[PDB]
Structure 1
Amino acid sequence: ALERELLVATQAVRKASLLTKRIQSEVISHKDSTTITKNDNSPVTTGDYAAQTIIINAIKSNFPDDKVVGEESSSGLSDAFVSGILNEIKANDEVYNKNYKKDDFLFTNDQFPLKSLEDVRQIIDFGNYEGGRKGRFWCLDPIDGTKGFLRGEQFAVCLALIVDGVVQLGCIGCPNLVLSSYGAQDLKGHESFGYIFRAVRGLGAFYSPSSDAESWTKIHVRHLKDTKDMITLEGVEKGHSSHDEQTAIKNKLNISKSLHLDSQAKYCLLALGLADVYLRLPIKLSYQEKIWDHAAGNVIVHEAGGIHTDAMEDVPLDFGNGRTLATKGVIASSGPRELHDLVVSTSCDVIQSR
């Protein structure tokens, strides 16, 4: 009954998924002029900003008063860098409108026309909400897995709607995701810009090739009986999670198969039933996960029939605490409860043994 909201989220993510797919090599080749280092030393690129611009501008054209928690800020960007953001958006418009445009849907309007450099800045900075416990706000990681994006590997365009601290809607575009690499079948049309996954709480999880996004296929986690047959999902970047502790969990559970990839694409593989357990144990216990790294995934996994908690206490994640999660680490799985609890208590015991 977030009908309008689901359509808006889907088409916003779809457009940003094409831009990011198309731009990936040009960004990599021109790292010098396309890539900025933030205050925590992490990267941000033209792609991240462009995707955030398209998405917030679409949300605003359809829902002018809506609040957004977005990862990125325009502060300090030069005009030259911002003209580059605008140019990629307009370039992508020229390809997208020929080939994929959806009738009776607006990305821009009179109030938010997305025409000038000042427009791009204003739009990006509508992402400056700090979240919290009451009411409605959108939650946006324009490129999740920016390091993957830059490695030429996996990444995801991630958008969710939170209401009263609970994620009600999620949409994840995985523009580079090829299912045949994870043993499974690809759907016709997947080749151009990957797949989109999406869910509304209480109504199920679905996917579609991003080029299509009209015909939607219901997804669900699988239910293997023995952990010895299970498959983990873990990140690639050793600084984003505690790989050695994760290997200790696997070894204790007799898991011998894992997949490493960047981004909330991992949640999508889980929801699809191509793996069983998403492990993200914290390296340092002071880190607080950003809600935009987990919010879209939370509702997609839930609707696909899985379970999503922190990595120590075995409690549900609380998306009403602001920009960050107060718990430590994240673990999701296909369930059931007993399997999930086994995984999280192992993770607990591992961390306590430090």
Structure 2
Amino acid sequence: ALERELLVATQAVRKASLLTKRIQSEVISHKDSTTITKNDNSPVTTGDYAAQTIIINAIKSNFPDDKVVGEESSSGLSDAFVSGILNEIKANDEVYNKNYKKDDFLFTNDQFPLKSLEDVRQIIDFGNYEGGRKGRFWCLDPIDGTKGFLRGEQFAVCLALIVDGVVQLGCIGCPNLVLSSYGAQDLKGHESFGYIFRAVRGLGAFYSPSSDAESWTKIHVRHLKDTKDMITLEGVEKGHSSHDEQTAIKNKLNISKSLHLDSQAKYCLLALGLADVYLRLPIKLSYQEKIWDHAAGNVIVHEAGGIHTDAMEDVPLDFGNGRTLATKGVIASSGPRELHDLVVSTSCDVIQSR
């Protein structure tokens, strides 16, 4: 099961990973024309939109009826802005097809040719599904960690398939990820556009350099015995999680090592066995996490042998509630259960002591 879906997800993420790697420096340099502010003041760039367009167009060319929950919308974009999205797509195609073309795989077809400004708008807006409890849908964050992208640091291209509220398939491109930065080994070909991580429920978790994406290496969480030796994974942006409460947890558990980076690349490092505990405590309890921020990681961490819950109740995440998660915060770990429950119960106690 899901063999065709896995191929499509992988190639879609692969092409978008090249585009976003290549753009990163020009967006930052031209970040007066390439960057828009959304209704919540968060940034969105030509890259986010271009990645969403490539990925949804590939999904639709292969699965015409499929539903997609994608973060971005084309509403209000000018023709000038949309022509820039199209240009970046076609510029990337010219590099990608010389070098990385996959035989017998289509990114576009007769019904979804991706030729005009109007095609771009239509494809972006196929991401307007609201999710829910029954049936099959794709879940897409075209650039997870846009603030990291803009900082020239880490970001991820994230695609998942949800069926009956459960994540069945996940694929995360980490285009700027260099494992030696974390003291670990890099694989042949990693330098051009990073790594892809993927998993299908029941079938294990794997990775490959993005430029390869043909030879897959199986991954698994590690198992350290004492928390004193462990490493946390946390975000960089102080407004996205409660860093001081995370520090309280670390101190209580005698953890003295942490890696800060943007995006679901954090789940990939956990699944690879390079750290032990992902912490994302909520600053404001009114916030509802978006499914696209966690869905691909959920199945990858599970298939790598880890555990994924909220930050307070210690319950599984429920991906059948619409666009958002109803629980508060997120914690993932290598397990075992006893370790995971120690962490989440500490998190609960810290939050309740406010």
CA deviation after TM superposition for structure 1 residue 216, in Å? 0.1
CA deviation after TM superposition for structure 1 residue 244, in Å? 0.2
Superposition RMSD in Å: 0.2
Q: Deviations over 1:278-325 (max 9, x none)?
A: 000000000000000000000000000000000000000000000000
Name the CA distance, whole Å, in 2 between partners of 1:318 and 1:348: 19
Q: Deviations over 1:33-65 (max 9, x none)?
A: 000000000000000000000000000000000
2:73 partner SS: coil
1:162 match: 162
CA deviation after TM superposition for structure 1 residue 86, in Å? 0.1
1:288 match: 288
Name the CA distance, whole Å, in 1 between partners of 2:304 and 2:349: 28
Name the CA distance, whole Å, in 2 between partners of 1:52 and 1:146: 13
1:32 partner SS: coil
TM-score by length of 2: 1.00
Name the CA distance, whole Å, in 2 between partners of 1:257 and 1:101: 41
Name the CA distance, whole Å, in 2 between partners of 1:151 and 1:227: 32
CA deviation after TM superposition for structure 1 residue 137, in Å? 0.1
Structure 1 unaligned residues grouped into runs of 5+: none
Structure 2 unaligned residues grouped into runs of 5+: none
Q: Deviations over 1:205-234 (max 9, x none)?
A: 000000000000000000000000000000
CA deviation after TM superposition for structure 1 residue 147, in Å? 0.1
1:103 match: 103
Name the CA distance, whole Å, in 1 between partners of 2:110 and 2:283: 47
1:332 partner SS: strand
CA deviation after TM superposition for structure 1 residue 72, in Å? 0.3
Moved over 2 A (4+): none
Q: Deviations over 1:5-37 (max 9, x none)?
A: 000000000000000000000000000000000
2:32 partner SS: helix
CA deviation after TM superposition for structure 1 residue 256, in Å? 0.1
CA deviation after TM superposition for structure 1 residue 189, in Å? 0.1
CA deviation after TM superposition for structure 1 residue 276, in Å? 0.1
Name the CA distance, whole Å, in 1 between partners of 2:34 and 2:252: 43
Number of equivalences: 354
Name the CA distance, whole Å, in 1 between partners of 2:35 and 2:104: 35
CA deviation after TM superposition for structure 1 residue 332, in Å? 0.1
Q: Deviations over 1:160-202 (max 9, x none)?
A: 0000000000000000000000110000000000000000000
CA deviation after TM superposition for structure 1 residue 133, in Å? 0.1
Name the CA distance, whole Å, in 1 between partners of 2:281 and 2:253: 16
Name the CA distance, whole Å, in 1 between partners of 2:7 and 2:105: 9
CA deviation after TM superposition for structure 1 residue 275, in Å? 0.1
CA deviation after TM superposition for structure 1 residue 144, in Å? 0.0
Name the CA distance, whole Å, in 1 between partners of 2:252 and 2:79: 54
Name the CA distance, whole Å, in 1 between partners of 2:298 and 2:170: 8
Q: Deviations over 1:85-104 (max 9, x none)?
A: 00000000000000001000
1:88 match: 88
CA deviation after TM superposition for structure 1 residue 70, in Å? 0.1
Q: Deviations over 1:120-175 (max 9, x none)?
A: 00000000000000000000000000000000000000000000000000000000
Identical residues among aligned pairs (%) = 100
1:12 match: 12
Name the CA distance, whole Å, in 1 between partners of 2:53 and 2:337: 40
Name the CA distance, whole Å, in 2 between partners of 1:134 and 1:21: 35
Name the CA distance, whole Å, in 2 between partners of 1:205 and 1:17: 19
2:33 partner SS: helix
CA deviation after TM superposition for structure 1 residue 260, in Å? 0.1
Name the CA distance, whole Å, in 1 between partners of 2:324 and 2:35: 25
1:230 match: 230
CA deviation after TM superposition for structure 1 residue 262, in Å? 0.0
Name the CA distance, whole Å, in 1 between partners of 2:228 and 2:192: 36
1:62 match: 62
Name the CA distance, whole Å, in 1 between partners of 2:29 and 2:227: 42
